[PDB]
Amino acid sequence: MNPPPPETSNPNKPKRQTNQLQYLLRVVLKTLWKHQFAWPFQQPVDAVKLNLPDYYKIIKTPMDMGTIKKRLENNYYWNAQECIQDFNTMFTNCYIYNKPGDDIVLMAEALEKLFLQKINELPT
Ligand SMILES: COc1cc2c(c(OC)c1OC)-c1ccc(O)c(=O)cc1[C@@H](NC(C)=O)CC2
Ligand code: NA
Numbered sequence: 001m002n003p004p005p006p007e008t009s010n011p012n013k014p015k016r017q018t019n020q021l022q023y024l025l026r027v028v029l030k031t032l033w034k035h036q037f038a039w040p041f042q043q044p045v046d047a048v049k050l051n052l053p054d055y056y057k058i059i060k061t062p063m064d065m066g067t068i069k070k071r072l073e074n075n076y077y078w079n080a081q082e083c084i085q086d087f088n089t090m091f092t093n094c095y096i097y098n099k100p101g102d103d104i105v106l107m108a109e110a111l112e113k114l115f116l117q118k119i120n121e122l123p124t
């Protein structure tokens with residue numbers, strides 16, 4: 001059975017809009033979302049559908065771009081690093097569950113390279 005998705009909105013948290021947070025939604029997330037290899041990462045891993053009965057035994061901090069999109073939208077992150085950490089968690093989850101050179105891993109690696117290039121261009 002799948003777990004509920006990660007939390008995406010917390011109204012009790014203070015909210016701010018920042019250059020970097022806008023860039024993360026409007027440029028970084030938008031570009032990754034449209035990538036050839038985006039689709040596996042656009043929603044939580046559905047371990048039941050994908051037939052990975054052990055997935056949530058091994059991955060205890062699931063993350064995905066749908067979740068990240070929501071978090072940005074709901075001003076869930078105070079600091080840009082929180083967002084960057086979520087992307088890093090998503091890529092690493094893939095590397096952790098799978099094995100070096102797996103097709104899915106290569107796809108994640110490609111997405112990550114684009115992500116890193118975009119991060120290098122994050123505004124001050
Ligand atoms: C976002 O993470 C994952 C997303 C997916 C898969 C997966 O496990 C290999 C993941 O975890 C690393 C996946 C799973 C099971 C399959 O049977 C399959 O054919 C295919 C896949 C994936 N496609 C591949 C491996 O080529 C697509 C969905
Ligand atoms: Na398969």
Ligand code: NA
Binds near residue numbers: 036110
């Ligand atoms: Na590519």
